[model samples]
Target chain A: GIVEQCCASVCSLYQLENYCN
Target chain B: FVNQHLCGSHLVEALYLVCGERGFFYTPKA
Candidate 1:
């Protein structure tokens, strides 16, 4: 839920790491 | 704070940068 909301449309993979970590 | 709307505030910085870069790429270079 967090990452989905964090990533608006197309988020960078780094952001993914930030979300993941 | 604006934190209410931001799902992942950490990415805001990156998002802004992406927006700027996208704008530059789409803008006419002429």
Candidate 2:
């Protein structure tokens, strides 16, 4: 899903947030 | 404007900060 992708991408750039999971 | 919700709109802006001009192309499904 795009939301998941966005979350993951953001996490990758920012060292993983709880929101990514 | 029917689907305009706070969290939903924030996601687009979040991606925009990281993904640049094409960020709006990846809006959330919710």
Candidate 3:
């Protein structure tokens, strides 16, 4: 589930990346 | 629209992992 966790973590970045970048 | 497209691609890796785990390719349906 580490893969899922990593992906989920990046998704959070994707959220901020969407808003800020 | 381009900005939205950018967002979608950024999501593609996660999408790929999820769908790939389920034995399929990732694609946006929403």
Candidate 4:
């Protein structure tokens, strides 16, 4: 859902980069 | 808020591991 997507994007900001599956 | 709870937990876990003992905090509410 949107919350998961948002969290994934935030992770990218920290350099985690992988998309949430 | 189920998705938020789950994703938030994972995010915190990832950050904790990546950032080490410095730690991270997540609140389910404002």
lDDT of 1 by residue, A1-21 (tens): 434544444444443333321
DockQ of 3: 0.05
Clashing pairs for predicted structure model 1, backbone only: none
Candidate 1 lDDT over B1-30, as tens digits, reads 223233344455544444453431111121
Write the residue-wise lDDT of candidate 4 on B1-30 in tens digits: 212333656665654555555554444342
Q: How close is every model to the real structure, measured as TM-score?
A: 0.27, 0.35, 0.25, 0.38
After TM-score superposition, the amount by which residue A13's alpha carbon in candidate 1 deviates from its true location, in angstroms, is: 6.9
The segments of candidate 3 whose C-alpha lies over 4 angstroms from its true place after superposition are A1-21, B1-6, B21-30
Task: Give the TM-score of chain B in candidate 1.
Answer: 0.31
Docking quality tier of model 4: incorrect
User: Candidate 2: lDDT of A9?
Assistant: 42
| Residues B1-30 of candidate 2: C-alpha lDDT, one tens digit per residue | 112222355665554565554434543564
Best by TM-score: 4
Cα lDDT, all candidates: 0.38, 0.42, 0.36, 0.43
DockQ, model 4, C-alpha based: 0.13
What lDDT score goes with residue B26 in model 1? 18
Q: lDDT by residue for model 2 over A1-21, one digit each (tens)?
A: 555544434334442122232
